[PDB]
Design a protein around this ligand. Structure first.
Ligand code: NA
Ligand code: NA
Lengths: 152, 152
């Protein structure tokens, strides 16, 4: 099934964060998401340091590392500039809590969630499908406020 | 300039191989190539073990690691099956020697070279452009024999 709300993930999102941080001790996380990939659910954790971007994919049930990728940053991102995109992950609500808030704004089926930051606000972005349409709901990761609803 | 024959690479292909092997001590190399990427020349070294494929990109002049990627192998490649593609890199001629042989078979400009294996033969595959056409010349990595000429 594709409903993230009807799944239990043996690996909590905090464990995925910790696996990433343990491997790349100087990196800041800039993106985190959970999505279905065929018959697996997969966390993608992305971060940067002064020199590289790093991307890890982790099975959300088995904790297996499916991808671990380092790439040199572009010129315009080096020397800490990429780090400005870092997420504020302290004292945030759980993905479950964010998905429940989003579902009360827009019913349907939750297909994906991510954490992202713009304008200094770290938000959950919940992807919800209903009938023909796809909706992205942005929820403030601390306050629970619905920040934006967009029909994709 | 794009002519590999008119370049000097400060990092020999053997150093790129050694960087890869030093990082992934149990992996077998299955592909190696040198190509131009914008204003850099870049070695791509790919290998596998029982569980993962590994890909590294190394600047052919500065030795900087531009990419280091690990991915879980597909089901059909696991448990050593991917390893069957491993290159025979012992006692082979240099890329310079292979390119000279290829150029005598087909004049033009050398744009890329790679090492690959099929039918248990490890060969250099030299990419040569002449007028409108692109040619791949395969040269036996030990014997220097021209094995195949194809117009791409
Ligand atoms: Na981000
Ligand atoms: Na190969």
């Amino acid at each position: 099934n594709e409903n993230l709300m009807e799944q239990d993930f043996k690996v909590p999102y905090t464990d995925a964060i910790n696996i990433f941080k343990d491997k790349y001790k100087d990196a800041d996380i800039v993106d985190l998401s959970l999505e279905r990939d065929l018959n697996k659910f997969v966390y993608t954790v992305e971060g940067v340091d002064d020199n590289n971007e790093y991307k890890m994919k982790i099975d959300a049930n088995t904790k297996d590392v499916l991808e671990d990728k380092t790439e040199k940053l572009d010129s315009e991102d080096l020397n800490g500039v990429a780090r400005k995109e870092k997420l504020d992950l302290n004292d945030i609500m759980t993905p479950q809590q964010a998905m429940e808030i989003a579902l009360k704004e827009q019913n349907g089926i939750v297909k994906e969630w991510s954490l992202d930051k713009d304008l200094d606000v770290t938000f959950y972005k919940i992807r919800i499908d209903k009938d023909k349409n796809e909706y992205d709901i942005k929820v403030d990761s601390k306050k629970g406020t619905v920040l934006k609803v967009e029909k994709e």
